[model samples]
Target: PQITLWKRPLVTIRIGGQLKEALLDTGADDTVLEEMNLPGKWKPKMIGGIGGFIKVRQYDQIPIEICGHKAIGTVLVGPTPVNIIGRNLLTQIGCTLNF
Candidate 1:
């Protein structure tokens, strides 16, 4: 038997003053926060890691609402022509994707 897969319309997430549409891809192992679409004033630095503690700084915590769901996190700012969604945000939302 062959397993069937399904895809839905890309969901647009709002952050700062912009909107982003992303495909819900659960096959990916990480939740990627795109850097190019982030605001200039949002930043987050949290401490805690393998060696006991470290400060991870971010330039933005974009706010994304999935239809009726909401998620906020520090996103990685890539150079350009790229988009992503990683495990961190997906696991937090209890998301199960069919992609």
Candidate 2:
């Protein structure tokens, strides 16, 4: 599927059996999600962004479903204005820039 980069490309994704709306951020290097209860071990980490850095919980090998496509990878939980699907995960979904 193709997407328009005119604005933040948001998509519906399922994480930990819950449906969530997240933005496909090509500029982001890691996937970040709003705070949620996840069943697994996590490590404390800090991530930097345009809005500065924030403390987050890093969970590995998390199962996620994006636009009917399924994948497992690292997910960062933190207090973010919006959930973001970074390039790390986007590539798994075969997302590419057409323009």
Candidate 3:
């Protein structure tokens, strides 16, 4: 899809049979979702938290649909700044930017 970056591209994406509005962040390399319960198995991981470690869940090959196209990719669940779609999923969805 040819998404025009008029404003913050906060597109609605479908994941874990649920709906959410996330930002299409070109600066991010991975898709970071808000802390929420999602279906299926999730691999355990950790992240930096106040100079300590924070528990994280990694959901692999999770089906995500954006616009009219869908792609299965890894989803990181943790304390992120915001829910955003990164280059990983964006690349799989065959998206590009134009001037």
Candidate 4:
């Protein structure tokens, strides 16, 4: 579906059975979320942000619902101020930029 990209493209998404709002950032390569409890096992990984680097738990094959679209992929949990639906998940939802 077509989504409007404003100063910040925000959308509602469900992660780990919890619903939350997230930014639809095409610049981001992977999906990142605020701290939350996940049921499965994850591996330790580091990600660089605008501020600096941060430790994150990388969980694979995570099920996420984005604006009624279901996607299963990698999800990173860390000290992110906001949830981000990156390209990895966005492609599943058929998100595209319309300018």
Top candidate (TM-score): 2
Residue-level error in angstroms, candidate 3, position 98: 1.8
By lDDT, the better pick of 2 and 3 is 2
After superposition on all C-alphas, the RMSD of every candidate to the true structure, in Å, is 7.3, 1.1, 2.9, 1.4
lDDT of 4 by residue, 28-68 (tens): 88899989889889999999978999999999999999988
Instruction: Give the whole-model CA lDDT for all candidates, comma-separated.
Output: 0.51, 0.89, 0.82, 0.88
> On TM-score, who's better, 1 or 3?
3
Steric clash count of candidate 1: 8
* 5-92 per-residue lDDT for model 2 (tens digits): 6777888999877999999888889999998999979999999998899999999999899988877899999987799998888888
Residue 26 of model 1 has an lDDT of: 57
Candidate 1 backbone collisions, by pair: 30-86, 30-87, 31-85, 31-86, 31-87, 32-85, 32-86, 35-77
What TM-score does candidate 4 get on C-alpha atoms? 0.90
lDDT of 1: 0.51
TM-score of each: 0.52, 0.93, 0.81, 0.90
Q: What is the Cα-based TM-score of model 2?
A: 0.93
Ranking by lDDT: 2, 4, 3, 1
Clashes of each: 8, 0, 0, 0
Candidate 3: tens digits of C-alpha lDDT, residues 22-72: 998877777888898878899888755335665769998888998667989
Q: What's model 2's overall lDDT?
A: 0.89
Please tell me which model should have the higher TM-score, number 1 or number 2.
2
